[PDB]
Swiss-Prot record:
Protein role: Inhibits host translation by associating with the open head conformation of the 40S subunit. The C-terminus binds to and obstructs ribosomal mRNA entry tunnel. Thereby inhibits antiviral response triggered by innate immunity or interferons. The nsp1-40S ribosome complex further induces an endonucleolytic cleavage near the 5'UTR of host mRNAs, targeting them for degradation. This inhibits the integrated stress response (ISR) in the infected cell by preventing EIF2S1/eIF2-alpha phosphorylation upstream of stress granule formation and depletes host G3BP1.
Organism, scientific name: Severe acute respiratory syndrome coronavirus 2 (2019-nCoV)
Domain of life: Viruses
Coiled-coil features, chain-numbered ranges: none
Subcellular localization: Host cytoplasm
Region feature Disordered, mapped onto this chain: 1-113
Protein's recorded name: Host translation inhibitor nsp1
Domain CoV Nsp1 globular residue range list: 2-113
Effect of residue 37 to R: In strain: Omicron/XBB.1.5, Omicron/EG.5.1
Amino acid sequence: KTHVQLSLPVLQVRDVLVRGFGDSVEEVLSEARQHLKDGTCGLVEVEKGVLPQLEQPYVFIKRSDAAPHGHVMVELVAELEGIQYGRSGETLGVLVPHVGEIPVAYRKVLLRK
């Protein structure tokens, strides 16, 4: 399928143990997509002070359209040293590995895969 319904655990930035997906834009997009397929991806909501506490390159989920079955349609955009790879809508959050941190909420998304 071109899209997959996922329910992503929303993590507090100070709880995150693994603060990024790797070392290059292509690696972090690759790993993000693998962890989304494996159910081992979390979401951190972006506010003042969050991104400097995580590791670049960043992987964002961004709204791809204006929400089937309560799932916002999203796609991935990476960022390294202020350059984004992809073009999309509003940021829903930054993706990180999930390694068993307790979430504060779940974010239902339809991921363009």
